[PDB]
Design a protein around this ligand. Structure first.
Ligand code: SF4
Lengths: 95, 180, 160, 117, 353, 166, 427
C-alpha cells in the first residue's frame, strides 16, 4: 500500500524533471524514471490480484527498451552534426 | 582527429612522431616528423681522422653495425687505390653475413612482439645471443665492434672461432624453420 | 515492516530527487543506476523475483550503458546549457509536479483493498505456462516491436 | 516461495566485499609523500591531452550498444521457456521458434548492412 | 534451495570474509606462479630471488604498490576517479561464493557456498554485465579523451561477448530444468558431465568467458603498442593495482565456472571428496589459458567484433533451437549425445588433418 | 598522512620498495637494443619484478635513460620524468647519456644531469647487459640507505628531492 | 488472415529488399497492401478471434481506412533506400494491430509499433524535418509514460487488463482519465494538439498525408473501445473546436492550415463517441479520409516543400480536372450539402443529441460556420490568375486516384444509404 503511493511520487518527480532540464538527452532520461514508476505500480497490484501483473510488467520493459533505443538513436543522429544539445535552440517551426 | 603518436610512447618504438589524420575508423594520413636523434654524424666526422672514423660508422645503424663499417672501409680503400689481401675479404664476408643474420633476428624478434603476443621474441633472441657470443670470440666484443682498419682486419681469426662457428652452422636451419 | 520499509522507500525517493535535480549528465545517469538497484530489491521483497533479476539485467545493465554511451559520445558538461526565456517557468513546473501527485494521491485513498495473495516468489517456472500459454500472442507482438526498432534505428543513423 | 534466507545473505556478501574494498582504498590513499608538478597536473605527453581533445567519435559505439540492448531483451524472454520447457509441449517449441525467427530477421538485416559504417 | 540447508548469518559473514581474503591471497600467489609458468615457456627463469623461492616477491610487490603517490590529475571527475576502481573490483569479487566446491555438510558443520539462490545463473549473468560499468566510467573519469576512446573500444567489445554468454548457458539449463548451480552439479552426477550433451555450448562458453580481457582480443586494449587502452594510463598508486587485480580475479572466476557447469562440480566416478577435485578442474583450465596466452597472437578489434557478434551468436542460438526441440518432443538424451559427438567430429576434422 | 615514521616500519617499507624495483625504459638509440638484451633468455632479469613488460611511466618507477638524447628531446624526457609518482630514480645507462660520449656538439646534450638528477651511472658504449644488472644492484643497495661513497658521506636514498620538479 | 498477409510480407520483405531495386520494392509493397486489402474484403463480417486479436465491426471498418491511406502515400515517393517503404509497411501493420485489439498491453505494444516508424519517416533530412521529428518523439515519449501509467492504475481498479469489467469508485474514474490522454494526443484532440501544427509543417508532404489519414483512423479505432466519461468528451470537444478553428484563421501556410483543420475534425468526430457508434464514425471518416487524401495528393503535385497559400492559385488553368477535384474536396470538409461531408457531420451530431448534451452541440455548430473562412480561402483561390511557381502534372496514375476520390466523394454524398447499411458494427 505504501509502495503504491511511492509509485505516484516517483511519477511526480519525473514530471518535474521533464519540464526543467535544458539538455535533451536528460529529458529522455527523466522519462525513463517515470516508466519505472509505472512498473512499480503495476507490480504492487500484481501482489493484490495475483500473477498476471508480472507478465504485464515484463512486456512493458520490452516496449520501454524499444522506445529508448530508437529515441536516443534519433537524438544522436540529429545532434551529431549540431554541436550543442540545447533543445530550445531548435525554433523555427513556430506559430 | 589529428592524433599525436608521441615520442616513443605510447606505442613504444623508436622515437618517431606521427600525426595521424584520422576520421575515426579510417586512417587517412600520417604526417611523419623526425628529428629526435639528430646528433649529427655528418658534422662530427669532419673533425676526426680516418682511423678514428671507423669507430663512428657503427654508431649510426646498430642492428646491422658492421655494414656501415664495411661500406666505409671500401670507400676509402678504393679512393687511395690499394688492395686488400684475399683472406681479408674472406673474413670480411663471413663477418658481414654473420652480422646480417644478427640484424634479421632482431628485426623479426621485435616485430612479432610489437603486434602479436609474447613468445616468438625469446626464441629469436636466443639465437641472437649465440651469434653475439660468436662475435665476442673474434673481435673481442659485441655489437659496435671495430675490426676493419682499412685494407683488412686488425687481427687474425683465433683458433677457436672456427670450431664455434661450426656449432652454429649446424643448428641454424632447424632453428630458422620454427620462426616460419 | 515499516522499520525496513522506510529505509528502502526513503532511499528510492531520495535517489529520485537526485536524478532530476543534479548537474551533469554522468552523475545523473549514475544515480538512476542506484535507483534501479533499490527498485530491484523492492521487487524481490514483493515476491517477484524473476522480474527483479530482469530489472537489473535489462533496465540497469543494458539500457543505462546505452544512455552513458550517448552522453559520452556527444559530451555533456552542463545539465543547464544556454540561457533562454524559460526561467520563471521553473516554479510553475514545480507546482504542476505537486499537482500531478496530488490528484493521483487522492485517487489511491479511493479504493483501498487487500494485499493478501500468493505468487510463488515469481520464479520463472510459474510464469512460463502463462507466458507461452495464452499470452503467446502478446509475446509475438513484443517480438515484432524489437525487429521494427532495429530496422528503424539503422535507418536513422547510418545513411543507407 | 523461495527462502528469503539467502537473499539477505547476498546483501551480507556485498557488505563484506565493499568493506574490504574501501578499507584497502583508504590504506592506499593515506600513505606515500606529496609533491605536485607542472606536467603531472597538465595531462599526458604531446598536446594538452594525448588525443589533444578531438571532438566526436564514430557512431559505431552507438551501433554496438544499440544492438546489445534489444537483443538482451531477447535473452530475457527465452529464460522463462528455458527453465520449464517440458511442461509446454510441442506448441511451446512452435511459439519459441516463431519469436526467435523474428529477432534473427533483425540480425541478418543489420548484419548485411554493416556493423562497420 | 527448497531442500538444502541454509547458513547462520554470522557464519555467512565468516565464510564471506574468508572468500574475500582467500581470493586476494589466491590472486597474489597465482600471479607469481603465472609469471613463472610463462618464464619456463619462454625458456627462462622468472622471480627466483627474494627468497626462499620467490615467495616473498608478491609481498614486496604489494608493499611497493602502496606507499606511492596517488594523484588525481587536473582535468578529472573527482568523484568517479575515486569510485571507479571500487566498482570494478566489487563486481569481480561477487559470484565466486555462488558456486559450490564441495558437497553439502562438509565445511565442518556448514555448507560450501556463500549463497546458492533459486535463480543462480541470472545472478551470475548479472555480475558479468556490471564489470563493464567500472570500465567505461574510468574512461570518462580519467578526463583524457584518449583514455575515453580506448575505454569505448573496450566496453563495446566486452558487451558484444556478453550477449553470447546468455545464449550459452541455455543449453545446460534446459536439460537440468532448474537454474541453480547445485542442481546442475547433481544432474551431472547421474546423467553425464554436461560437456557431453552440449559440446557446442562448452565451446561457445569457453571462448566467450575467455574474451573478457584475457588476451586474444587485446585491442581491449592494454595501452602498450597501439591506440591506447584507456582507464589506466592516468592512475598511479593504489587504484592502478585494483584494476589489474580485478582482471585476474575475473580470470580465476571464469576458470571455475567452466568446471562447475560443464564437467561436474566435484562429482566423479572415481572418488568424491569435497574440495580437491574442484581445485584440480580449476587448475587444468587455469593452466590451459596460460599456454594459450603465450603461444598465439592478438586480434584486432575489427576481427574480434566479426567473430563474436557475427559468428558465435548464430551458433549459439542454433544450438538453443536444437536442444529446445529435443526437449520439447521429450525425447531420449541419447539424441543429444549423437549430435554433440558429431559436432566434436566436425570441428576436429576441420582443424586436425 | 605524509610519509613514514618509526624505525621498525621504515626498515620494513625500505625492504619492500628496494627489492621490487620496476623499470620504465626510455629507449633512445643503440644503447636501447642492448638494454632489451638484458631481459631475454640467457641473460638474467626478471628477478626483481622487472619480468613484466611495463612501459608507461605511470605503471612503473625507475627510469632507465638509455642512449643519446638530442637537444630537441630534452623537454620531452623532462616531462616524462615529471609524470612519475613520488619515489622515482634515474639509472643513466651509457656514455652518450652520462656525459655525452664521443659526441661533443651543438646537437647532443652532454651530461644527462641537466634534465634530471642521476642516481646511478653505469659506464660503457654500450655497457653489456650484465653491467646493467650490476647497476640495478647498486641502485638496490643505494635505496636501502647504505649509500656511502669514498668521501664517507651517504646520499639520501631518494635523490629527486635533490632537485625540484616544479 | 489480414494479419497473416501483413506480418508475412513484412518479415519476408525485410531481408528480401536487398536484392530487389528500390522501384521493385515499391512495386512489392504496393502489391502486399493490396493483397491485404483483398483479404479484408473477402472475409468481411465474420468476426474471428485467434488470441487477444479480435476482428469485429470496428476493426473491419477502420482498418479498411488505415490500409487505404497507406496505399496512397506509398504510391507517390521515389526513394534512395528501400527502407522508406519498409518502415511504412511496418507502420501499417502497427495501425492494423491497434484497431483489432481490446487488451491494454496489446494496445501499448501497438502504440509503439505505430509511433516508432513515424518518427523516422519524418526525415527526408530537411532541417525543419529534424526539429519536427524531435518534438514528436519527445512529446510522444511523454504520452508513452502517461498511457502506460494509466494502464497500471487500471489494473488496480479492476481484475481485467482487458477493457470491460464493471468499473468502480474513484480509482476507476482516475484510470480512465489518463487513458484518454494518450489516445487523445495521437488523434490530436486538444489540449494535446501542440505537436500537430509543427509536425505537419515540418514533415515532407506525402508523409503528412499518411498521418492525416491513417493515424486519425487508427487512433479513433482504439479510442472507441474506451467508455469515455461524458464529461471528458465535452471538455475535449470544446477545446478542440474552439482553438482549432479560431487559430486557423491566422495561418497562411497550406499544410499547417490543414493541420489546424485536422484538429477540428477530430473535435467533431469525438462527439460520435458519446453513445458510441461505429456506423457514424465509419461513414464520417470515410468522407474525411477521401477528402484529405485527395487534398494532400494535390498539395504534393504543387511542390514537396512548404507550400505558401498563394501557390494554390491558378490550379484550374494548370489542369482542369485536378483543380475541380481539390474544390470538391474543400467544400466537402466544410460540409456544404449534398456532399458526403454533411452526412458525416449529421450522424455524429445525432448521437450527441440523443445523449442530450445540448450546449456542446451548439458551440460546435456555431464555430463550424467560422470554418468556412479558410475553407473557401482555399477552394475559391483555385480559379484566380495563374501563378508563376513550381508545379508538375504527374502521370495518369495520380490523375485517376485524385479524380476517383473526388467522384467517389460526391457519390456518397447523394447515396449514403449504400454504405451505411453495411458498415454494421456486429458483422
Ligand atoms: S654510449 Fe654508445 S651504445 Fe650508447 S647510445 Fe652512445 S653510441 Fe650507443
Amino acid at each position: 500500500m505504501s509502495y503504491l503511493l511511492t509509485s505516484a511520487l516517483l511519477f511526480a518527480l519525473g514530471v518535474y524533471g521533464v519540464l526543467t532540464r535544458r539538455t535533451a538527452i536528460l529529458v529522455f532520461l527523466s522519462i525513463e524514471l517515470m516508466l519505472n514508476a509505472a512498473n512499480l505500480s503495476l507490480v504492487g497490484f500484481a501482489r493484490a490480484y495475483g500473477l498476471d501483473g508480472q507478465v504485464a510488467a515484463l512486456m512493458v520493459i520490452a516496449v520501454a527498451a524499444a522506445e529508448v533505443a530508437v529515441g536516443l538513436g534519433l537524438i544522436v543522429a540529429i545532434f551529431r552534426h549540431r554541436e550543442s544539445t540545447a533543445v530550445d535552440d531548435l525554433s523555427e517551426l513556430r506559430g | 582527429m589529428t592524433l599525436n603518436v608521441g615520442p616513443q610512447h605510447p606505442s613504444t618504438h623508436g622515437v618517431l612522431r606521427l600525426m595521424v589524420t584520422l576520421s575515426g575508423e579510417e586512417v587517412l594520413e600520417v604526417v611523419p616528423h623526425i628529428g629526435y636523434l639528430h646528433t649529427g654524424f655528418e658534422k662530427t666526422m669532419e673533425h676526426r681522422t680516418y682511423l678514428q672514423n671507423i669507430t663512428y660508422t657503427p654508431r649510426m645503424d646498430y642492428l646491422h653495425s658492421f655494414a656501415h663499417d664495411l661500406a666505409y672501409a671500401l670507400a676509402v680503400e678504393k679512393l687511395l687505390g690499394a688492395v686488400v689481401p684475399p683472406r681479408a675479404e674472406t673474413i670480411r664476408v663471413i663477418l658481414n653475413e654473420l652480422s646480417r643474420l644478427a640484424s634479421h633476428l632482431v628485426f623479426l624478434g621485435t616485430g612479432l612482439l610489437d603486434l602479436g603476443a609474447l613468445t616468438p621474441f625469446f626464441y629469436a633472441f636466443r639465437e641472437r645471443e649465440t651469434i653475439l657470443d660468436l662475435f665476442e670470440w673474434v673481435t673481442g666484443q659485441r655489437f659496435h665492434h671495430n675490426y676493419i682498419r682499412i685494407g683488412g682486419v686488425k687481427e687474425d681469426l683465433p683458433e677457436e672461432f672456427v670450431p664455434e662457428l661450426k656449432k652454429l652452422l649446424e643448428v641454424l636451419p632447424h632453428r630458422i624453420d620454427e620462426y616460419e | 515492516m515499516s522499520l525496513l520499509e522506510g529505509l528502502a522507500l526513503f532511499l528510492l525517493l531520495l535517489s529520485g530527487v537526485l536524478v532530476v535535480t543534479l548537474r551533469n549528465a554522468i552523475h545523473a545517469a549514475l544515480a538512476l543506476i542506484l535507483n534501479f538497484l533499490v527498485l530491484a530489491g523492492v521487487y524481490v521483497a514483493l515476491d517477484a523475483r524473476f522480474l527483479g533479476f530482469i530489472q537489473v539485467i535489462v533496465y540497469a545493465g543494458a539500457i543505462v550503458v546505452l544512455f552513458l554511451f550517448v552522453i559520452m559520445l556527444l559530451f555533456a558538461a552542463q545539465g543547464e546549457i544556454g540561457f533562454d526565456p524559460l526561467v520563471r517557468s521553473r516554479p510553475l513546473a514545480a507546482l504542476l509536479a505537486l499537482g500531478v501527485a496530488g490528484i493521483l494521491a487522492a485517487g489511491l485513498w479511493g479504493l483501498d483493498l487487500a494485499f493478501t495473495q500468493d505468487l510463488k516468489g515469481g520464479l520463472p517456472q510459474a510464469l512460463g505456462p502463462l507466458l507461452y500459454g495464452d499470452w503467446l500472442f502478446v509475446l509475438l507482438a513484443v517480438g515484432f516491436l524489437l525487429m521494427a526498432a532495429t530496422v528503424v534505428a539503422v535507418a536513422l543513423v547510418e545513411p543507407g | 516461495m523461495a527462502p528469503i534466507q539467502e537473499y539477505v545473505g547476498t546483501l551480507i556478501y556485498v557488505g563484506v566485499a565493499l568493506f574490504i574494498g574501501v578499507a584497502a582504498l583508504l590504506v592506499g590513499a593515506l600513505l606515500g609523500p606529496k609533491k605536485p608538478g607542472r606536467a603531472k597536473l597538465m595531462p599526458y605527453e604531446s598536446g594538452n591531452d594525448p588525443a589533444g581533445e578531438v571532438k566526436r567519435f564514430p557512431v559505431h559505439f552507438y551501433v554496438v550498444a544499440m544492438l546489445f540492448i534489444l537483443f538482451d531483451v531477447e535473452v530475457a524472454f527465452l529464460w522463462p521457456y528455458a527453465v520449464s520447457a517440458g511442461g509446454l509441449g510441442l506448441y511451446g517449441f512452435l511459439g519459441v521458434l516463431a519469436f526467435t525467427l523474428l529477432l534473427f530477421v533483425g540480425f541478418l538485416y543489420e548484419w548485411w548492412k554493416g556493423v562497420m559504417r | 534451495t527448497w531442500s538444502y540447508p541454509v547458513d547462520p548469518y554470522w557464519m555467512v559473514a565468516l565464510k564471506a570474509l574468508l572468500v574475500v581474503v582467500g581470493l586476494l591471497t589466491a590472486f597474489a600467489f597465482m600471479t607469481l606462479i603465472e609469471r613463472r609458468l610463462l618464464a619456463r615457456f619462454q625458456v627462462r627463469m622468472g622471480p627466483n630471488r627474494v627468497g626462499p623461492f620467490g615467495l616473498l616477491q608478491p609481498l614486496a610487490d604489494a608493499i611497493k604498490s602502496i606507499f606511492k603517490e596517488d594523484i588525481v590529475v587536473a582535468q578529472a571527475d573527482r568523484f568517479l576517479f575515486v569510485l571507479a576502481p571500487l566498482i570494478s573490483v566489487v563486481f569481480a569479487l561477487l559470484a565466486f561464493g555462488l558456486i559450490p566446491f564441495g558437497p553439502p555438510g562438509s565445511f565442518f558443520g556448514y555448507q560450501p557456498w556463500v549463497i546458492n539462490l533459486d535463480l543462480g545463473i541470472l545472478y551470475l549473468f548479472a555480475v558479468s554485465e556490471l564489470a563493464v560499468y567500472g570500465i567505461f566510467l574510468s574512461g570518462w573519469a580519467s578526463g583524457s579523451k584518449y583514455s575515453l576512446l580506448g575505454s569505448l573500444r573496450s566496453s563495446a567489445s566486452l558487451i558484444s561477448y556478453e550477449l553470447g554468454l546468455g545464449l550459452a548457458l541455455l543449453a545446460p539449463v534446459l536439460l537440468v530444468g532448474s537454474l541453480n548451480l547445485n542442481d546442475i552439479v547433481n544432474w551431472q552426477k547421474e546423467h553425464g558431465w554436461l560437456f557431453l550433451y552440449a559440446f557446442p555450448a562448452f565451446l561457445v562458453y569457453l571462448i566467450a568467458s575467455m574474451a573478457e580481457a584475457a588476451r586474444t582480443p587485446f585491442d581491449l586494449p592494454e595501452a602498450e603498442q597501439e591506440l591506447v587502452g584507456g582507464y589506466h594510463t592516468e592512475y598511479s598508486s593504489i587504484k592502478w593495482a585494483l584494476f589489474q587485480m580485478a582482471e585476474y580475479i575475473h580470470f580465476i572466476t571464469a576458470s571455475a565456472l567452466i568446471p562447475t557447469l560443464f564437467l561436474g562440480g566435484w562429482t566423479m566416478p572415481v572418488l568424491e571428496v569435497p574440495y580437491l577435485w574442484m581445485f584440480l578442474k580449476i587448475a587444468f583450465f587455469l593452466f590451459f589459458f596460460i599456454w594459450i596466452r603465450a603461444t598465439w597472437f592478438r586480434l584486432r578489434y575489427d576481427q574480434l567484433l566479426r567473430f563474436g557478434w557475427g559468428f558465435l551468436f548464430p551458433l549459439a542460438l542454433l544450438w538453443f533451437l536444437v536442444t529446445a526441440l529435443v526437449v520439447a518432443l521429450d525425447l531420449p538424451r541419447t539424441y543429444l549425445l549423437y549430435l554433440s559427438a558429431l559436432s566434436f567430429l566436425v570441428l576436429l576434422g576441420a582443424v586436425l588433418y | 598522512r605524509e610519509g613514514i615514521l618509526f624505525t621498525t616500519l621504515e626498515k620494513l617499507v625500505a625492504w619492500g620498495r628496494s627489492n621490487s624495483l620496476w623499470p620504465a625504459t626510455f629507449g633512445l638509440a643503440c644503447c636501447a637494443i642492448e638494454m632489451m638484451a638484458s631481459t631475454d633468455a640467457r641473460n638474467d632479469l626478471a628477478r626483481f619484478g622487472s619480468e613484466v613488460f611495463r612501459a608507461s611511466p605511470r605503471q612503473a618507477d625507475v627510469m632507465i635513460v638509455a642512449g643519446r638524447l638530442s637537444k630537441k628531446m630534452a623537454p620531452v624526457m623532462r616531462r616524462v620524468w615529471e609524470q612519475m609518482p613520488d619515489p622515482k630514480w634515474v639509472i643513466s645507462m651509457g656514455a652518450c647519456a652520462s656525459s655525452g660520449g664521443m659526441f661533443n656538439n651543438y646537437a647532443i646534450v652532454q651530461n644527462v644531469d641537466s634534465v634530471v638528477p642521476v642516481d646511478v651511472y653505469v659506464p660503457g658504449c654500450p655497457p653489456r647487459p650484465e653491467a646493467l644488472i650490476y647497476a640495478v644492484m647498486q641502485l638496490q643497495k643505494k635505496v636501502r640507505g647504505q649509500a656511502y661513497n669514498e668521501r664517507g658521506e651517504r646520499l639520501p636514498p631518494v635523490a629527486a628531492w635533490k632537485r625540484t620538479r616544479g | 488472415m489480414t494479419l497473416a498477409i501483413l506480418a508475412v510480407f513484412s518479415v519476408a520483405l525485410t531481408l528480401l529488399g536487398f536484392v530487389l531495386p528500390p522501384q521493385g520494392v515499391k512495386r512489392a509493397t504496393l502489391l502486399g497492401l493490396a493483397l491485404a486489402l483483398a483479404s479484408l474484403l473477402l472475409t468481411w463480417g465474420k468476426p474471428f478471434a485467434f488470441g487477444p486479436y479480435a476482428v469485429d465491426g470496428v476493426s473491419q471498418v477502420f482498418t479498411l481506412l488505415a490500409l487505404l491511406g497507406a496505399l496512397w502515400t506509398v504510391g507517390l515517393v521515389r526513394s534512395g533506400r528501400f527502407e522508406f517503404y519498409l518502415l511504412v509497411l511496418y507502420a501499417a501493420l502497427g495501425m492494423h494491430l491497434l484497431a483489432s485489439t481490446r487488451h491494454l498491453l496489446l494496445m501499448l505494444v501497438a502504440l509503439e509499433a505505430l509511433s516508432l516508424p513515424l518518427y523516422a519517416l519524418a526525415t527526408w533530412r530537411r532541417g525543419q524535418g529534424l526539429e519536427a521529428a524531435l518534438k514528436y518523439f519527445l512529446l510522444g515519449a511523454l504520452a508513452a509514460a502517461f498511457f502506460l501509467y494509466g494502464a497500471a492504475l487500471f489494473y488496480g481498479a479492476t481484475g481485467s487488463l482487458v477493457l470491460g469489467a464493471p468499473g468502480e469508485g474513484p480509482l476507476y474514474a482516475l484510470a480512465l482519465g489518463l487513458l484518454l490522454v494518450g489516445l487523445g494526443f495521437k488523434a490530436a484532440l486538444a489540449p494535446f494538439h501542440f505537436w500537430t501544427p509543427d509536425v505537419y509543417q515540418g514533415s515532407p508532404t506525402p508523409v503528412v498525408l499518411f498521418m492525416a489519414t491513417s493515424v486519425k483512423a487508427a487512433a479513433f479505432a482504439a479510442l472507441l473501445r474506451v467508455a469515455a466519461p461524458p464529461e471528458a468528451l465535452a471538455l475535449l470537444v470544446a477545446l478542440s473546436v474552439v482553438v482549432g478553428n479560431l487559430a486557423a484563421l491566422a495561418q497562411k501556410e497550406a499544410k499547417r492550415l490543414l493541420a489546424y483543420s485536422s484538429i477540428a475534425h477530430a473535435g467533431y468526430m469525438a462527439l460520435a463517441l458519446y453513445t458510441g457508434n461505429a456506423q457514424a464514425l465509419g461513414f464520417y471518416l470515410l468522407t474525411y479520409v477521401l477528402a484529405t487524401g485527395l487534398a494532400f495528393a494535390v498539395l504534393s503535385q504543387i511542390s514537396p516543400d512548404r507550400v505558401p497559400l498563394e501557390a494554390l492559385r491558378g490550379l484550374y488553368r494548370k489542369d482542369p480536372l485536378l483543380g475541380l477535384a481539390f474544390l470538391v474536396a474543400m467544400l466537402s470538409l466544410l460540409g456544404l450539402p449534398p456532399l458526403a461531408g454533411f452526412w458525416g457531420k449529421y450522424l455524429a451530431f445525432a448521437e450527441a443529441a440523443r445523449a442530450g448534451a445540448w450546449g456542446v452541440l451548439v458551440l460546435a455548430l456555431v464555430t463550424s460556420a467560422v470554418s468556412a473562412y479558410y475553407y473557401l480561402g482555399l477552394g475559391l483561390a483555385v480559379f484566380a490568375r495563374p501563378e508563376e511557381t513550381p508545379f508538375r502534372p504527374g502521370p495518369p496514375w495520380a490523375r485517376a486516384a485524385v479524380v476517383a476520390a473526388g467522384v467517389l466523394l460526391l457519390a456518397l454524398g447523394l447515396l449514403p444509404g449504400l454504405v451505411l447499411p453495411a458498415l454494421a458494427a456486429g458483422g
